[PDB]
Structures are given as C-alpha cells and as structure tokens.
Amino acid sequence: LSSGINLGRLRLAEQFSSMNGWQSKEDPAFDAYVKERRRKENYEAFDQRVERGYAAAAKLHKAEIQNAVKRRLKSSGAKFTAETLREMSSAVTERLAWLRDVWAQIDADYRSGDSARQETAAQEISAALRGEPNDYMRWVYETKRELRFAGPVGRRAIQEELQAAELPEVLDEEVNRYHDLKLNMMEIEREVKAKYGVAGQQHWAELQAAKDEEYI
C-alpha cells in the first residue's frame, strides 16, 4: 500500500537509518522539533541535585498515595477496579505537578547566588536524598485532621486562611496513616534527655519504674 502515511513512515525510516541524514542543519522539520523541545527544556529543567531530590520526594509521595488507596480499599473491603486506578493515577500526577511547583522554588534558591538561600536549598536537597520526610507534610496532615475535628467557626477560619495557600489535595487516608503510627520510644527518650537534663533522666527512670510495675 503506497499511501501517504506509508510513504511518510518509509522516508522517516530511511532518514534515521544511518547517522548522516538527521544531524544539525540538515533537515529543517527535525531541527524545528528539537528547537522547540530544547526551548521547553531550557525553562522546565532544574539543577541535577535538585532533580535527584525531586525524584526521591516524588517516589515517596507516589508510594504514600498508593498506600492511601491501599488503606481505603483495605478498610472498605471493596475491589480494585479501573476507576480506582484512574483516581490513583490522577492523584499521583497532580501531586507530581505540585512537587514540581514546590521544587521550582528550591531550584531557584539553589541557583540564586545568595549564601543563605543556597545553604537552605542544599539542606533541602540533603534531607530529600537521605529519605527524611518533610515537616511541611506533618503540618499539612495535622492541620487537615484539625480541620476535620473542628467546629464550623474553626472550620471556616481554617478554610478561609488556607484558601490562597496552595496546599496539596490530601486524602483522608494519608492523614489516618500518619495519625495511626505509634511513636518511637528512643526518640522521645533522646528528646527528653536533650531538652531536660538530670531531671529528664530521673523522669525517664520513674517512667521505666512505672513500666516495670505494670509488667508485674
């Protein structure tokens, strides 16, 4: 079938066959395509460490949204249909767009030239690369739970304060997953022995005494 689409595919196949026919200043349509692609790439690219930190944070956010959908389907007992997959993919893509809009600021601060901006951006990149989660996400989960459990005056106050602050669309299952986690004992012990001194050690000793009394 010698048609327009087939002949176009044939000349495209013989064009990119060798190395010669597709280089710079040889074919104008491919040059315009690569010019538009490099034009978009000049605007929407980051620094390489910013891209690595964004990749780690995007992996964490994708895993957290998938865990939220798992928790919802585990609690409800329903099945994983194509509609839940569509919802999960839409939530993941909008969270990745929000993370791009967040990390644009970190890329701007890493490429600003000021000392404090670059050091805070390097701190954010090093926190993202080690796998340490954000405190902004903790504040977002806590204010979503407090928006859930407040009355209508407090609900209207939180909804009117945070209507212009571009907050991520967080499901209820993420807040429930953050809330239902047990707290670490040794981190609380380190905080109570760093914030308070020998009084903190005596308080932890009487706490362990109460623990061993409840063991009896």
Binding site: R9, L12, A13, E14, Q15, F16, S17, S18, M19, N20, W22, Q48, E51, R52, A55
Partner: protein, 203 residues
C-alpha cells in the same frame, strides 16, 4: 551509602585481623555486585541497535525501555525479565534490524549507548549518579554486549534454535540439560545431578 559502609567495615576488619580474609572479601564482593545495572545495560544495549525512524523499532524500544524501568523499580523479578528479554531478542524483526544496522556502515549504536548512559543517569537507574559513564567505558573497551554485532551477549540462550542446530555439536540431533545416569564415570565429581550447557563451560 551501603557500599561505603561495606568498604569501611572491610577496612576495619582487615586491619583488626592483620590479614585479608575470605569472609570479609566475600561480603564486599556481594555488596558491590547486588546492583541490577547489568540487566539495565542489557536492555539499553539491545535498544541501541534499533532505528529511531522505524515504527517496529519504536515498539521494541518502548518494550525494552518499560522492561528496564520495571527491573529498576524492583516490581519485576530477574528471571521473568530475562524471559521477556530473550523473547524480545529472539524475534526475527529485531535480528533484521540488527542486520540492517550492520550492513549500513555508519551505524548509530554508539550514540545509542551514549544516550542510554545519559538516560540511566537522569532516571536514576544506577547506584551512583556518574557510574553509568564508567560502565559505558567498560562495555566499550572490553568484550561485552556492546561489541557484539547484534547487541546482546553472545550466549546461545539469546540465539534461535534453528541457528543453534547446524553449528553446534550437542547430545543428539535428528530447556535444562542433564547428564544421563548411564555415565557412571564421567569425571571426578561429575554425575547426573550436574547440569551441562551448550555454548559454555560454567565450571
């Protein structure tokens, strides 16, 4: 930084024992070789010999790219991925594309493996962010899948059976291969539980 932790525990153990033991070196040989960069480089060396203008090559390229991203994500195990790779490699279309690229003369597989190293750097398919270029240098300057004329490692598991028959001299002509137990004296430790392989001696 688990490889650096294995390196420093090797250093401290070998300085504590005042000798280079086998346990410590086996541990750091296992930590330095748990990376899945080998199969990703297999998929990308198979993708390098394709044609960016051909639609069938675009299908094979997207299939092997999805396969490499599935291995790098850890969602697909190694053996089923090797089955997918050997099914994509043994196809007559891929061998036809490799033969066309061989008969061309100004082949575009070097730019293929270079863009493959850049993609493995960008997508985070490696353990360290600049290890893909040294692995590219290792594939080029040594005998590997990059210097094969078809783009896969030259083992007989990645070649068709109709080409395996008239060349090689195997057990009987006209899967897993075993020694039949009529051979009671084959070697010193050779027996029926010892498998054999057509184009290599793994011993």
């Amino acid at each position: 930084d688990t490889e650096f932790q294995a390196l420093v525990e090797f250093i401290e153990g070998a300085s504590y024992d005042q000798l280079i033991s086998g346990r410590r070196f086996k541990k750091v040989y296992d930590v330095l070789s748990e990376n899945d960069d080998m199969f990703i480089w297999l998929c990308h060396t198979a993708m390098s010999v394709l044609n960016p203008g051909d639609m069938r090559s675009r299908l094979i390229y997207n299939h092997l790219r999805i396969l490499a991203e599935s291995v790098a994500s850890g969602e697909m195990t190694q053996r089923t991925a090797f089955r997918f790779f050997e099914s994509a490699v043994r196809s007559p279309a891929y061998r036809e594309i490799a033969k066309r690229q061989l008969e061309g003369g100004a082949a575009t597989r070097l730019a293929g493996i270079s863009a493959a190293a850049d993609v493995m750097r960008r997508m985070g398919l490696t353990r360290r962010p600049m290890s893909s270029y040294f692995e590219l240098y290792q594939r080029i300057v040594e005998r590997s899948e990059a210097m094969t004329p078809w783009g896969f490692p030259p083992l007989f598991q990645f070649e068709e059976r109709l080409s395996l028959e008239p060349r090689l001299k195997f057990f009987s002509r006209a899967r897993i291969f075993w020694i039949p137990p009529t051979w009671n004296r084959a070697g010193r430790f050779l027996g029926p539980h010892v498998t054999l392989y057509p184009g290599m001696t793994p011993d």
